[PDB]
Amino acid sequence: MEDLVSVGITHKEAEVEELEKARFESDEAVRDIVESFGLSGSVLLQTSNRVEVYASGARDRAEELGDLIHDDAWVKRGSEAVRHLFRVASGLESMMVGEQEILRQVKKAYDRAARLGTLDEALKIVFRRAINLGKRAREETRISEGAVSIGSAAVELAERELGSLHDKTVLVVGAGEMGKTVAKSLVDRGVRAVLVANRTYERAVELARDLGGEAVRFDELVDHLARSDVVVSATAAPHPVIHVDDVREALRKRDRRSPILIIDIANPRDVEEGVENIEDVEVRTIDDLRVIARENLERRRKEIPKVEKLIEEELSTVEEELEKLKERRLVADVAKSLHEIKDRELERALRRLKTVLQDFAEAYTKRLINVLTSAIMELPDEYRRAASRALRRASELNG
Amino acid sequence: MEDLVSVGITHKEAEVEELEKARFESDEAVRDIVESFGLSGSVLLQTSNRVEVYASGARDRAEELGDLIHDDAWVKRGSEAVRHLFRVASGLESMMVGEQEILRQVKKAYDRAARLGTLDEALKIVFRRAINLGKRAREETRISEGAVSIGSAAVELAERELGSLHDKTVLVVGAGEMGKTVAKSLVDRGVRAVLVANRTYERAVELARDLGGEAVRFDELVDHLARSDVVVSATAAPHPVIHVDDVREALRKRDRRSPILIIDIANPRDVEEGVENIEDVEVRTIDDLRVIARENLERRRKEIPKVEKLIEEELSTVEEELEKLKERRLVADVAKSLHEIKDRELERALRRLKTVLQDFAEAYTKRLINVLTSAIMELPDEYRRAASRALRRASELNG
């Protein structure tokens, strides 16, 4: 544990511009860092909301590591560093608490390191456990349940108002960005068709392409309504585009009764007052979506302590993992140190008090190795390494 | 070095009552301290102007050691602790800079420890060097030359005014304490006889006894003067006791001309104005003595840097001494640790792959001992001991 440090700056303590600066431009930054600091390993985790460097073997240069991130970068050591990673992977350090994306981003960080050669066994253990933990926390708790963005909220609302969306048609009117976000969420959920209309046909062709939908004429809005079940209206011009008369006409046009959900994303409003009172029509706003997202976010936050309990349990596990690792690495070294004295010394008894018992010293050597590894175990790691260094320096020279 | 601490309070930072409190009452305090703190050794140096405890092996309990001295006791470690000792023995921490007494007091501290069993090899090395240094500093520099008290100043003045004192007679008139101090210094220097007079005969008998002199009658003052060469006058009553007429009569009485020095210690003055103008008579005061002492003290202070240079040289020497000590103690332990594995393991090869080469392993063991001692050498002492402990724990158990 103690041989790991974490350095970084995040949205928890810095603004969107202090984060940008700190961001590393080069896809190979994790590799450069390893060389420029003689690290055993490193993983670089960077998103719009954090820049964090995990390093193995940094360790008298932790504050320095902090420096090529930012003058207010924090520095975490050992258990705290791993705990922060576990909190990041589990979604606890994200604005959208529990979000799936940050887990994907931790995995990408791990892969980029794997492929650039900046992983060591220790970071493999930590990251592997971090990744499996993020998955478990999201399965065993409710930390990632419930819509916490406008897009996902629109899907919850549509599902509640209309049922299964798979066979529904979405009409998108206008090009406002929040409208594009809502439409993409509906599309990702699964709908049958998307119709796109805009007062400038070319804006429509563009968005339909994005969405995988069909650009339609703005002047045929009545027929569009007649065939649609969810309407996403986000026009830029300040005039309403969905009128009572058009909606009534669209509904009389269709032989089959079914509910229509109209989501008014524009301000001023795209939907004429009174549309909401037409029978089979439901009207909701961008504000209604923000309310849904907020209620769900507030609920996800109440799962944080259950996730934190999972984390402390997992910390104890990885701690023992890392110890077994060091035990394994401690014996192999010591043994190479003691076998080299054994070999050197083997020749010499050969030249005798003249004028295979191979043997006693392979046994005595095994005994010595076990004795020494424990002793280096046995009082710590701040050291362990140098004493492991000392035994090893002394063996090559004095041996 | 690093295994030594010094704790204490001195006149440099505390007043005469903060020192008293801290003082240890029991002649056996140094021994009690050793037990109550599990020390390898300790020397207690205590005088009216300092209470200092030197401890070997205290070392995670240094601040604690500070506590049974005083809440403002300082704590010195390693080199600084030894440097302070060297400064104390050399007279540099004393009000009377360079004074002989503090060196005697350091030696007594060393002897008391020797005799109570609280010395270890390390404190022997340090104290021995401290003692030999105090002697050298006082021989090779002028740090302890020149009178720096009223008593010693009176001897300088008497010697300058009169020459050799060995054949001179001292007359002491009165019992004022500063008069007693002056007389004792003259006596310690070497005079032929001391006459003691007081308006109360019994006060005289008392002081003469102290001084090893003769009590004489106060009313025979003229004859006393006639036979004396130095007069120390320190009467308590406010009347002058040495009068012009008596001095002239005393001088006409004596066949042989020789100078008389009269030291007036009293205030108001014991000596009548005008006595100083009698031919062959010299009169000086307690004030004149303070002037002499001060000039000499100011001169001794200018030798401080030469003494400090001696000290830094000596620190480097003892530092190497203490290192050789630890090397010696480090090999003997390690060897006992490795020979016990050697012995344990020796039996067992005996039981063979059946169904003296004593020998190869005495050689291999010697090799191992040299290798290991260096490694424990090799990265430090904050540790060295525990690693020396670790090797040793691991050997008894795993061996």
Ligand SMILES: CN(C)c1ncnc2c1ncn2[C@@H]1O[C@H](CO)[C@@H](NC(=O)[C@@H](N)CCC(=O)O)[C@H]1O
């Ligand atoms: C080209 N570029 C900078 C870019 N391209 C595509 N998507 C991007 C992006 N930057 C950011 N994003 C996305 O926009 C969100 C807000 O900035 C991003 N959010 C995250 O990466 C979160 N997953 C971070 C969580 C954390 O706690 O660190 C992303 O969805």
Ligand SMILES: CN(C)c1ncnc2c1ncn2[C@@H]1O[C@H](CO)[C@@H](NC(=O)[C@@H](N)CCC(=O)O)[C@H]1O
């Ligand atoms: C009984 N008793 C307390 C006592 N008896 C005899 N002499 C004593 C004494 N206490 C002190 N002395 C002497 O008086 C001086 C002033 O207090 C003492 N000075 C010292 O011990 C110096 N040598 C200290 C130097 C230092 O730097 O610590 C002593 O001469």
